Swiss-Prot record:
UniProt-annotated catalytic positions: 104 (nucleophile), 159, 172 (proton donor/acceptor)
EC number of the protein: 3.1.1.74
Cysteine pairings via disulfide bonds: 15-93, 155-162
Species this chain originates from: Fusarium vanettenii (Neocosmospora pisi)
Catalytic activity: cutin + H2O = cutin monomers
Keywords associated with the record: Disulfide bond, Glycoprotein, Hydrolase, Secreted, Serine esterase, Signal, Virulence
Description of pH dependence: Optimum pH is 8.
Intracellular or extracellular location(s): Secreted
Description of activity control: Inhibited by n-undecyl phosphonate (C11Y4). Inhibited by paraoxon.
Superkingdom assignment: Eukaryota
Processing and modification events after translation: The 2 disulfide bonds play a critical role in holding the catalytic residues in juxta-position; reduction of the disulfide bridges results in the complete inactivation of the enzyme. O-glycosylated; contains one mole each of mannose, arabinose, N-acetylglucosamine, and glucuronic acid.
Lineage per the UniProt record: Eukaryota, Fungi, Dikarya, Ascomycota, Pezizomycotina
Any single GO CC term annotated in Swiss-Prot or TrEMBL for this entry: extracellular region
Protein name (database record): Cutinase 1
């Protein structure tokens, strides 16, 4: 449900094939928030409970509304926190394909992490999905240093955070359908395109 720590809790001797690291939006609970469980259930259907570890970014990521105003749209302490989960993934389970996602502040956190990540771990992320990406206009729909074909951005018409603002309007809260169909679909498809472990 809203907290999943499958990578922290997982046994290295029994590595899943796919690890999803997800960062939640502002003020959301647990470490998955309102969209993370939906995507998680569908990935579990595609690969089985033991084929996929779902890991949310917790620890120092507080998902404080105010940090959207910071230079990268998130605190440096949250970037260090997600960066460390990508590095735990790569060390615990080197053969696993990674996938990532984020909503609102977590889409800006997912883009800032991936931009700073070591290239050999970044290249292991077969697909990333961003919902209501606060840096969409600034970054022209891309995550820096990361292929356009592996990125999918869900930005609703009228979601002001997609169009250079930080005003939260109603379309910003309307990504439940996407998290239920299109986004797991894109992720399962990018993972099957390269394969698993």
């Amino acid at each position: 449900r809203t907290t999943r720590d499958d990578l922290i809790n997982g046994n290295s001797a029994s590595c899943a094939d796919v690890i999803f690291i997800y960062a939640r939006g502002s003020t959301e609970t647990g470490n998955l928030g309102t969209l993370g469980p939906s995507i998680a259930s569908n990935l579990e259907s595609a690969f089985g409970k033991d084929g996929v570890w779902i890991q949310g970014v917790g620890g120092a990521y507080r998902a404080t509304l105010g940090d959207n105003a910071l230079p990268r749209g998130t605190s440096s302490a949250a970037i260090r926190e997600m960066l460390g989960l990508f590095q735990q993934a790569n060390t615990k389970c080197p053969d696993a394909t990674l996938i990532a996602g984020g909503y609102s502040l977590g889409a800006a956190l997912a883009a800032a992490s991936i931009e700073d990540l070591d290239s050999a771990i970044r290249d292991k992320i077969a697909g990333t999905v961003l919902f209501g990406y606060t840096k969409n206009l600034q970054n022209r729909g891309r995550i820096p240093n990361y292929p356009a074909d592996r990125t999918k951005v869900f930005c609703n018409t009228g979601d002001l955070v997609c169009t250079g603002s930080l005003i939260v309007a109603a379309p910003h809260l309307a990504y439940g359908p996407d998290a239920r169909g299109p986004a797991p679909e894109f992720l399962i498809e990018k993972v099957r395109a390269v394969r698993g472990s």
